[PDB]
Design a protein around this ligand. Structure first.
Ligand SMILES: [Fe+3]
Length: 53
């Protein structure tokens, strides 16, 4: 799945992960640590929205 940072438009792509910040490719958004933040703008996980109907 992909999720959008509602602040800055960064896409958390579960297939890409976030390896520069400790997240291997394939990590579901729910499994990101509670204090993981958007790597672009610093927004908390609460500011992301899943890109699905
Ligand atoms: Fe952001």
């Amino acid at each position: 799945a992909k999720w959008v940072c509602k602040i800055c438009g960064y896409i958390y792509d579960e297939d890409a992960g976030d390896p520069d910040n400790g997240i291997s490719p394939g990590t579901k958004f729910e499994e990101l640590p509670d204090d993981w933040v958007c790597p672009i703008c610093g927004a908390p996980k609460s500011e992301f929205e899943k890109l699905e109907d």
